Amino acid sequence: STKVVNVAVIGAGVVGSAFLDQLLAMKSTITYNLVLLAEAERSLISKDFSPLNVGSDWKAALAASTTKTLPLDDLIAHLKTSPKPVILVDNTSSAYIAGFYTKFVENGISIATPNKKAFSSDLATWKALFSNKPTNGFVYHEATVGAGLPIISFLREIIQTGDEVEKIEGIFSGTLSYIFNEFSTSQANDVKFSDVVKVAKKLGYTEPDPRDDLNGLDVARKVTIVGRISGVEVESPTSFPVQSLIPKPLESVKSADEFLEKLSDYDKDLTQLKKEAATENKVLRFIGKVDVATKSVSVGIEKYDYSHPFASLKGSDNVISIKTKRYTNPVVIQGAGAGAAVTAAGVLGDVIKIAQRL
């Protein structure tokens, strides 16, 4: 195509690898020259912004590189000299990098990313990333919430058309969704919370240290983002009630292994609350809630009648219910909210969106 955009990638992790794969295989009218690939200290950099001749097994080419990664300030300066609109893809979860988004944006560099950090920081940095200055680059982050699901794009669309979001309620975590779906079920089950958590770990459905999936911290970030888009100036992921499923007695312990090894000793506590559902035929489930009218945001265990939808989800599917002035009966979008492929496509979906816009 006559249209050309240069893509600067960072992150060759699980998501990132899937991304690159999907990008390099996408045949499109528009032309996407991969001008940079960085993973930790190594990098493949095309000084003159022509497309890197990587192709198949970029992982290897990257691995064979003698090029050291540029410090972000230097990266920005470099990217500034680009002859064509630049899109920076950040497939990490780095705070450092996120800490640079405003520098990127104000310098004409657009960003596409699944990295929730920059969007779950202080409101000031948020307002800055979306000021739409003439000289600013575009900022898309669909993968930030629900992964590939059209959560952010839909919210932004209906708000532009004149709609007013009233309430959001959803399960925004694949790990926590998998867990409760197995633990708390319509049938009076008997599975020990710690058991499904051990399954979640081994099936790869969980972060190295499951405490990182259990502190709710991640769900709070996502809800901060949806809350801010819905019109609620959430100050941060800690400025509202968030319930950590971590047993106080183990907040101490150093080894993730020790934690998981002792997690069972507290099953009788969580099983209690699942047993106290009986208050109506109800099931428990970790959710993120946002009430616009009263600026109320929160994340923690919630209970629904065996008959409610949340009581019958799929594997790690994590749904979200959007109630707006126009949508009296909420919009419910559900599906996989984790996984390299699904997540990466959400990121590529955003890259196409930016490129068509440049």
Contacts of 187 (CB under 8 A, 6+ apart): none
The entry of a copy of itself, Na ion, none near residue 295 (CB within 5 to 8 angstroms by kind) is none
φ and ψ at residue 75, rounded to 5 degrees: -60, -50
- The crossing angle, in degrees rounded to 10, of helices 193-200 and 256-263 is 140
Site string for a copy of itself, 173-212 (x = CB under 8 A): -------------x--------------------------
DSSP state of 226: H
- End-to-end C-alpha distance for the chain, whole angstroms: 13
For the four alpha carbons of 179, 208, 241 and 122, in that order, the dihedral sign comes to negative
Does position 231 interact with a copy of itself (CB under 8 A)? The reply is no
Q: Is 63 annotated as a binding residue?
A: no
Residue bearing tokens 């307002």: 127
Nearer to a copy of itself, 275 or 357 (CB): 357
276 marked ligand binding residue: no
Candidates 161, 252, 272, 279: give the one binding a copy of itself (CB under 8 A).
161
Query: Across the strands, what pairs with 32?
Result: 5
CA distance 70 to 49: 15
Q: Does 333 bind a copy of itself (CB under 8 A)?
A: yes
The 13-32 contact track toward a copy of itself, x by CB under 8 A, reads ---------x--xxxxx---
Distance CA 142, CA 30 (A): 21
Residue from the set 90, 142, 213, 350 that interacts with Na ion by CB under 5 A: 142
Contact 84, 49 (CB under 8 A): yes
- 66 counts as binding a copy of itself under rule CB under 8 A: no
Q: Is 165 in the site for a copy of itself (CB under 8 A)?
A: no
**Binding piece for a copy of itself, criterion CB under 8 A, among 73-81, 254-262, 282-290, 348-356:** 348-356
Using CB under 8 A, which residues numbered 99 to 158 contact a copy of itself? 132, 134, 148-150, 153-154, 157-158
Query: Which of residues 44, 52, 62, 145 is near Na ion by CB under 5 A?
Result: 145
| CA separation, residue 305 to residues 33, 184, 190, 287, 334 (Å) | 51, 12, 19, 15, 18
CB under 8 A: which stretch of 40-48, 92-100, 201-209, 321-329 binds a copy of itself? 321-329
262 appears as a binding residue in the annotation: no
Residue burial 232-252, b: 16+ Cβ < 10 Å; e: rest: bebeebeebebeebbbeebee
Select which of 222, 274, 282, 289 is catalytic.
222
Residues β-bridged to residue 170: 288, 320
Radius of gyration in angstroms for the set of CA atoms belonging to the chain, rounded to a whole number: 21
Q: Nearer Cβ to Na ion, position 36 or 152?
A: 152
Active site residue 198: no
Which lies closer to a copy of itself via its Cβ, residue 62 or residue 342? 342
State which residue, 11 or 247, has the beta carbon closest to Na ion.
Answer: 11
Q: Judged by CB under 8 A, which stretch of 70-78, 96-104, 204-212, 312-320 contacts a copy of itself?
A: 312-320
Instruction: Choose from Na ion, a copy of itself, none: what does 145 bind? Cβ within 5-8 Å by kind.
Output: Na ion
User: Which one, of 248, 242, 265, lies nearest residue 194 by Cα?
Assistant: 265
Cα–Cα dist 241/239, whole Å? 7
Q: Which candidate, 110, 115, 94, places its Cα nearest to that of 32?
A: 110
Just list the catalytic residues: 222
Residues within the interface to a copy of itself (CB under 8 A):
1-2, 22, 25-29, 132, 134, 148-150, 153-154, 157-158, 160-163, 186, 307-309, 312, 314-315, 317, 322, 326-327, 329-336, 339, 341-342, 344-345, 348-349, 352, 356-358
Residues within the interface to Na ion (CB under 5 A):
142, 145-146, 149, 151
